[PDB]
Each structure stands twice: as C-alpha cells, then as structure tokens.
C-alpha cells in the first residue's frame, strides 16, 4: 500500500513545496503492468468500440 504510506508522509510533509516530489511520489504509487496488461487493456478498448459500432446500426433517426 502506497496510499497507506502517502497518508503518513503527507501527514508530515516537512513543509516541502516542490511538485516534483508531489507528482513523482504520486505516480510511484502505481507500478508497471504490461505484457498482458497491454493486450487485455487492448482487448477491452477494442471491445468498447466494438459494442459501439454494434450499437451504431439499426438507425431510425440517424437516417444519413
């Protein structure tokens, strides 16, 4: 858990101001996920637009 640790750190940021710390210590939370993250996220995206284009057809009002 990083939000569990961001809890304490943000509780006691030693009056730090640099958004470098903020952004990097935020984006360090979520790690790498690829090599099937890539393909399953891909299959999910293409399934999204697949069900879109499925939805598109049978058009009573969108006559053009």
């Amino acid at each position: 858990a990083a939000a569990q640790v961001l809890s304490s750190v943000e509780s006691e940021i030693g009056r730090t101001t640099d958004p470098v710390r903020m952004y990097m210590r935020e984006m360090g939370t979520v790690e790498l996920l690829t090599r099937e993250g890539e393909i399953d996220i891909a299959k999910r995206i293409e399934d999204g637009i697949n069900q879109v284009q499925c939805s598109v057809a049978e058009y009573p009002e969108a006559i053009t």
């Binding site: 990083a2 640790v5 961001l6 750190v9 940021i13 030693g14 009056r15 730090t16 640099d18 710390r21 210590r25």
Partner: protein, 50 residues
C-alpha cells in the same frame, strides 16, 4: 541521558529517519537509505579530506 531520550532501536528506522531528514517528504525505502549513508561518509566518490 541521551540514549534515554533516543526513541529508536534498530539500524533500520534510524536510517529511515536520516533518509527522511535529508530527503523530506520522501517515503521510507531501505536500499536508498543505506545507499545514501554509504555515499556520504565512506564513498570515495563524494567525500575527500585531501
């Protein structure tokens, strides 16, 4: 007397607090802690008496 004031016990959280002081706002990470310490006072790279 100072030991009696010391709240700390182990190498690890000691080094955590050192790490913290010199890198405020940063979470505790072991490797970076011992790396920092070893850079500062026993590394030939970044410390020289001449």
């Amino acid at each position: 007397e100072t030991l009696r004031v010391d709240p700390t016990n182990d190498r690890l959280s000691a080094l955590v607090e050192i790490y913290r002081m010199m890198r405020p706002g940063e979470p505790p990470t072991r490797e970076a802690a011992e790396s920092l310490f070893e850079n500062l006072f026993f590394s030939e790279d970044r410390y020289d008496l001449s």
